[PDB]
């Protein structure tokens, strides 16, 4: 029985390929077709396709075409020496709010001022002078930000293999693979150190990383309980409407209607115990005979250490130091309320000049909202990092970090890849061609 080569056409062999997926949403409105009214899904069966959420070529497709639509809605610096002082007053301590000098011819809260001093003889009077935080940055443009559940769909000729195994870890094989032409609701909300309005899991809290035994790799933690948060600004600002230029607007809002209550947040301490208690129970598995110590973040730029929000159109920077702040020797221990349970707060600062889109560098201006601001979201994910230190005595310290901006989207695109169908394949058999 001599074998012979035979070519077949219609083989189900797959090949991972890249493409330019198109958006889809209900209602930000350019190039996005409406959602599919018939979201078909076919379970393949006994297939084991090795996934890899870290080497995925879809996260780059989402990181791009989102700075692109962001730039389409932003199509100016005027850095002059300011002059201000402390405001006339869980309480606000120092929040400078004043007006500047000459605009063309003859209120910047706290993280957008840089102190200076002239060379005159006014040093005996203590006359301070400020400057904008992005005075020497490339382009400072000026403009509602509401996340819409964008759906990425595959083009003609390509498919999407969505796994369904509830025990994901990031890489390795899957056992329940199904094909879909689109995806679930993806909220493009930007934030650091915490993932808001994400997607909960189906089993216990799972962690995932490219190499858990490495320190530079981001450790994405997906929860299974929508921990709520209540961040609000109890102040009241009024639109100044300063016009500078031939038909140009600017809004350096501010009013004294009791500027003493500092904007903060509220997190359920009872719910926060059950979350971290299950996380340490999972981290102890990969890290045996060790103490999972949580600690304060790093330093440098103020937009790194703090959490980034978006509440109705204003950005909040909150000190996340009261969060995690413990040692956690064994599983589910080391509590600290002594019978309190009094809503652990987070003091927050508010910026106006935003170093928009981490990686390139092109700031923008956020127009303030007239009145009180109140928002509420669900803390569903967590970004972490491990400090590789030689003083490791069974205490591997973890920090919130924040990592790259792409890590906020790898926690939602970890379930699928884009494949191409190669239809021809060869195989040997016993037939022979007549000649």
């Amino acid at each position: 029985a001599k074998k012979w080569v035979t070519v077949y056409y219609g083989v189900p062999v797959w090949k991972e390929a890249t493409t330019t997926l198109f958006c889809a949403s209900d209602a930000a409105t350019h190039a996005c077709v409406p959602t599919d009214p018939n979201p078909q899904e076919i379970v393949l069966g006994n297939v084991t396709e090795n996934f890899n959420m870290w080497k995925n070529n879809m996260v780059e497709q989402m990181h791009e075409d989102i700075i692109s639509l962001w730039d389409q809605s932003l199509k100016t610096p005027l850095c002059v020496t300011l002059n201000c002082n402390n405001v006339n007053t869980m309480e606000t301590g120092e929040m400078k709010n004043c007006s500047f000098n000459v605009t063309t011819s003859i209120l910047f809260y706290k993280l957008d001022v840089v102190p200076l001093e002239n060379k005159n003889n006014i040093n005996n009077t203590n006359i301070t002078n400020y400057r904008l935080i992005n005075c020497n940055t490339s382009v400072i443009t000026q403009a509602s930000f509401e996340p819409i559940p964008i759906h990425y769909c595959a083009p003609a000729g390509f498919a999407i293999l969505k796994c369904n195994s509830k025990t994901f870890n990031g890489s390795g094989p899957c056992t329940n693979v199904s094909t879909v032409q689109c995806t679930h609701g993806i909220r493009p909300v930007v934030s650091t150190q915490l993932l808001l309005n994400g997607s909960l899991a189906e089993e216990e809290i799972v962690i995932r990383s490219e190499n858990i035994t490495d320190n530079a790799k981001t450790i994405i933690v997906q929860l299974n309980e929508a921990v709520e948060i209540n961040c609000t600004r109890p102040n009241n600002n009024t639109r100044k409407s300063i016009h500078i230029g031939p038909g140009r607007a600017f809004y350096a809002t501010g009013d004294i209607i009791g500027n003493i209550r500092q904007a903060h947040c509220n997190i359920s301490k009872a719910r926060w115990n059950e979350t971290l208690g299950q996380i340490v129970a999972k981290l102890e598995e990969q890290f045996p005979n060790k103490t999972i110590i949580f600690n304060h973040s790093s330093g440098g730029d103020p937009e790194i250490v703090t959490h980034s929000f978006n509440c109705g159109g204003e950005f909040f920077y909150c000190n996340t130091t009261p969060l995690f702040n413990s040692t956690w020797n064994n599983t589910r221990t080391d509590d600290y309320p002594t019978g309190g349970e009094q809503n652990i707060t987070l003091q927050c600062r508010i910026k106006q000049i935003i170093n928009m889109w981490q990686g390139v560098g092109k700031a923008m201006y956020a127009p303030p909202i007239r009145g009180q601001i109140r928002c509420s979201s669900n803390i569903t994910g967590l970004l972490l990092t491990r400090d590789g230190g030689r003083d490791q005595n069974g205490t591997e310290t973890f920090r919130p970090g924040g990592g790259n901006m792409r890590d906020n989207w790898r926690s939602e695109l970890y379930k699928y890849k884009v494949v191409k169908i190669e239809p021809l394949g060869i195989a040997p058999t016993a037939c022979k061609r007549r000649v």
Partner: antibody
Amino acid sequence: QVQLVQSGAEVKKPGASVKVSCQASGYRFSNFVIHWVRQAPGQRFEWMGWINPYNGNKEFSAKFQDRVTFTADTSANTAYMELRSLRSADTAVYYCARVGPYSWDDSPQDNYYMDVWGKGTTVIVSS
Amino acid sequence: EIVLTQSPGTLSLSPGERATFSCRSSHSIRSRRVAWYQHKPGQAPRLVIHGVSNRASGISDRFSGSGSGTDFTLTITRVEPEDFALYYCQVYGASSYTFGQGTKLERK
């Protein structure tokens, strides 16, 4: 521990492009701002600018406006410094520094005082 | 714009004395935020104080910063031979800041 290791010496002809590199080891390079200063034998130190590897924000002094450019690699934990033009007066020892951590009770620029320096490389224009 | 001045340039000191430093800037620092360095010959520079009076990490208690306005001073109680180096002054961290002249803790 935190340590910055620079590259070796690089003697180049006047009109070339010297590429001085930095290397972060004991921390996360994508979170701190890197400074570059210059030191001439007998003179004083002099700031050359900084680069923010997090958001790509670059700012260089007016004296080195069209002469020195800044580039950084996040995935390699290295910061680079290119020079457009050269001159025999640029024979000096180049450094590399790192800003400090940010506290909750200070201005956004009160923590750029160059905490950790580096083993300074030297360049010679005409030997 | 900003030019720093230091005095004295030399110090005829012995191990166990006290040194006097001064950084009279051309301007007057409003925030009162400066820094001081330690540059040994051959080695890498080292930060002395990360503020007008806030010392850096690992720096001993012998170094102590003080002053305000334009009288940016320093003092070294019970000097040691392991600190004989060049000391520089700072202004601030902003769009423009210069460096000091440089003192020398001479053994003679």
